[PDB]
Amino acid sequence: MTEYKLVVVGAGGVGKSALTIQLIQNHFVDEYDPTIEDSYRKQVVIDGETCLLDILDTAGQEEYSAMRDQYMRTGEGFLCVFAINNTKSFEDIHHYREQIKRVKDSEDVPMVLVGNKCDLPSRTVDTKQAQDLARSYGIPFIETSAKTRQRVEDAFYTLVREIRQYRLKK
Amino acid sequence: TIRVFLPNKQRTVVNVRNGMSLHDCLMKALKVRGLQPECCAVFRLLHEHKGKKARLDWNTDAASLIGEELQVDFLDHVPLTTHNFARKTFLKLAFCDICQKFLLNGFRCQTCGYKFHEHCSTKVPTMCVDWS
Ligand SMILES: Nc1nc2c(ncn2[C@@H]2O[C@H](COP(=O)(O)OP(=O)(O)NP(=O)(O)O)[C@@H](O)[C@H]2O)c(=O)[nH]1
Ligand SMILES: [Mg+2]
Ligand SMILES: [Zn+2]
Ligand SMILES: [Zn+2]
């Protein structure tokens, strides 16, 4: 059984934990419990293949110690989550992109841009802004909603397919 | 803070409030991972040769364990394990255990027999229950 080590990064309060728990439990966490470090493991089926997802939920403002540079080195795919009602969280996406590319010392790192909280009507980050940022990176962009579970499986399954295609480099 | 290792190669880091028991600190982390405190026990990891971990009561104050590293493990002989999925074509009429719809080409756990669609895989319970 093949394994995929996913890492969820983003600013604080963008819904990193809500998207992960919605995937493995189909339960929407309504409260705000700031994460420190949480590892999950769930068996799913993606494109007819039994996959073992090893998801690591990170903190919003994580300590820049050897612990942060270590999980980025052992991570195989990165989910970059921002809230559409938080423009500052979308601006922080650029830093996560360049930070992952420096710790791994490579390019073509499997990555997916995720715009969360699309159920709210107070949108401050236009969809054109995110698609322009994602197309310049060569990574897919997906709008998600952990509250109503909209394209939550599509966000993680897309990242897994990005790792599958990246593993076929030979 | 306290680093707590959880069953099935998982882990979490919890904040320490004085007076809060270990059960109340790890309750949400266990429920989210499909685990129940009734089937688990919390241990304090030792760093010597004689013994790897020492069991602690679930009501122990987490403040008395700052600087330590904890580990939650299943109790002895609990009927919980990991699933073993496999493709299967259901010649005898079968329905998905998640959506109760017709299941022709799906998946099945070789141990507990949980049958489901491809798109229903996330709703499958995390832990495999086998009572012989
Ligand atoms: N309306 C709505 N609220 C959401 C959505 N996703 C998350 N939230 C809410 O946003 C708040 C913060 O969510 P959370 O998952 O904890 O965010 P986080 O990215 O893990 N934060 P941290 O890095 O501090 O741990 C919670 O109150 C949660 O209910 C969504 O899609 N829609
Ligand atoms: Mg979180
Ligand atoms: Zn099973
Ligand atoms: Zn089904």
Author numbering:
A (entry chain A): 1 to 170
B (entry chain B): 57 to 188
Give the original sentences from the paper that presented this experimental model.
KRAS, the most frequently mutated oncogene in human cancer, produces two isoforms, KRAS4a and KRAS4b, through alternative splicing.
To gain insights into the interaction between KRAS4a with its downstream effector RAF kinase, we solved the structures of KRAS4a bound to the RAS-binding domain (RBD) of RAF1 at 1.65-Å resolution and bound to the RBD and cysteine-rich domain (RBD-CRD) at 2.65-Å resolution. Strand β2 of the RBD contacts the N-terminal section of strand β2 of KRAS4a to create an extended β sheet bridging the two proteins, whereas the RAF1 CRD interacts with KRAS4a residues located on the interswitch region and helix α5. The CRD of RAF1 interacts with position 153 on the KRAS α5 helix, one of the six residues that differ between the G-domains of KRAS4a and KRAS4b. The longer side chain of E153 in KRAS4a versus D153 in KRAS4b displaces the RAF1 CRD in complex with KRAS4a by 1.5 to 3 Å compared to the CRD’s position when bound to KRAS4b. These structural analyses demonstrate that the interaction of KRAS4a with RAF1 RBD-CRD is more similar to HRAS than the KRAS4b complexes with RAF1 RBD-CRD.
